[PDB]
Design a binder for this molecule. Structure first.
Ligand SMILES: Nc1ncnc2c1ncn2[C@@H]1O[C@H](COP(=O)(O)OP(=O)(O)NP(=O)(O)O)[C@@H](O)[C@H]1O
Ligand SMILES: C[C@@H](C(=O)Nc1cc(Cl)cc(-c2ncc[nH]2)c1)N(C)C(=O)c1cccnc1C(=O)O
Ligand SMILES: [Mn+2]
Ligand SMILES: [Mn+2]
Ligand SMILES: [Zn+2]
Length: 353
């Protein structure tokens, strides 16, 4: 009942949703219209993604994610240095070429410059652009000093997914082989997040994103097509993800003056959650009346990922989110220590008083 009380606190206010939805749509639709007036971005379209649109945003509707997608015909990908997730793109767009290479940094720079200029002309609403966030492919706005919106430029390809995904998306026993085939016929996206190059970055490179598929999975998440559509099939999958997100969010807030938790994000618990869904494919393994055990399942799986330093990207199995190339052993051991403490003491970080 403690966890149910936490979930109640984490629910979004209907009034907050109403106000935030109206503000975000108005700003983003406006910016989409304006971007379409530039010769480079004339074909851009909108794709809403991330936790708000997955219905697993917690506490307040104060952070939205949207892709501004662009279909570039005759796209040719080249994997960057066996990184599995990062690619060169080979091809109004000549302004972004460096050779035959379509430079991710050049496109993102112009994207940001246009948005910056357009929000300066917005006089009816309080809209500012936040300082660049290291390693982010997004341009981030703050509306009314309270609502953050991450706008990510994304190249769209309707080609077959890259070979690094061949063994990913292992949903056959959970969501079915038919659905896996259907999802892999959808487009994929490249976002301007650059591969590491020594102490710097390979500024021409793009990164694969399957944020849209993650949304498809979370909003059609049951083995039963009617999971969570009736009183007899309410599962606790989304509640477990919300609780894992809150656990990480609260620990990051508490330990914010440490650096050890700075490299963890909600995508780590999202990825681990998808793996637990693969391991537990039946809706009967996610019964509402088993919330406590299901959440403990999720926590101990995440702990094992930290201990083994293994957290495969759900779509790209050879991309290890917990590689020591990305996160120090010391940082993973530190997070392990804090989560173990929370588990062993019935999650005091969840308590308001
Ligand atoms: N490390 C990553 N690798 C791949 N995709 C990522 C990564 N981080 C974020 N994304 C994608 O970008 C989306 C938006 O990121 P973010 O706003 O951090 O997460 P979120 O899922 O919306 N959770 P939150 O906003 O904390 O409630 C995620 O849902 C992912 O699809
Ligand atoms: C680490 C970094 C990052 O790598 N994000 C990322 C990586 C990839 Cl590969 C794809 C996409 C994507 N695909 C579609 C839309 N966005 C995003 N990050 C998590 C953020 O900057 C961040 C921080 C706080 C809140 N929100 C975000 C955010 O990203 O929304
Ligand atoms: Mn988000
Ligand atoms: Mn975001
Ligand atoms: Zn369900």
């Amino acid at each position: 009942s403690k966890l149910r009380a936490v979930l109640e606190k984490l629910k979004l206010s209907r009034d907050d949703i109403s106000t935030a939805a109206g503000m975000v749509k108005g700003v983003v639709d406006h910016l989409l219209l304006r971007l379409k007036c530039d010769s480079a971005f004339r074909g851009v379209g909108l794709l809403n993604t991330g936790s708000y649109y997955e219905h697993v945003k917690i506490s307040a509707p104060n952070e939205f994610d949207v892709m501004f997608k662009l279909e570039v015909p005759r796209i040719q990908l080249e994997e960057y240095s066996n990184t599995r997730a990062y690619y060169f793109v080979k091809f109004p767009l000549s302004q972004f070429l460096e050779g035959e290479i379509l430079s991710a940094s050049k496109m993102l720079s112009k994207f940001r410059k246009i948005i910056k200029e357009e929000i300066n002309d917005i006089k009816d609403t309080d809209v500012i652009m936040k300082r660049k966030r290291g390693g982010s492919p997004a341009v981030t706005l703050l509306i009314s000093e309270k609502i953050s919106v991450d706008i990510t430029l994304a190249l769209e390809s309707k080609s077959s997914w890259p070979a690094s995904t061949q063994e990913g998306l292992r949903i056959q026993n959970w969501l079915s082989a038919k659905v896996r085939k259907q999802l892999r016929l959808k487009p994929f996206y490249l976002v301007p997040k650059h591969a590491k190059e020594g102490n710097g970055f390979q500024e021409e490179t793009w990164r694969l994103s399957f944020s849209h598929i993650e949304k498809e999975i979370l909003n059609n998440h049951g083995k039963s097509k009617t999971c969570c559509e009736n009183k007899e099939e309410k599962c606790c999958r989304k509640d477990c993800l919300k609780l894992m997100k809150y656990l990480l969010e609260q620990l990051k807030e508490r330990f914010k003056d440490e650096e050890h938790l700075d490299k963890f994000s909600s995508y780590h618990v999202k990825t681990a959650f998808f793996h637990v869904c693969t391991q537990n494919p039946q809706d009967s393994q996610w019964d509402r009346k088993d919330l406590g055990l299901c959440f403990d399942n999720c926590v101990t799986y995440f702990l094992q990922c930290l201990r083994t330093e293994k957290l495969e990207n759900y779509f790209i199995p050879e991309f290890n989110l917990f590689s020591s190339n990305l996160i120090d052993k010391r940082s993973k051991e530190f997070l392990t220590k804090q989560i173990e403490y929370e588990r062993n003491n019935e999650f005091p970080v969840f308590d308001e008083f």
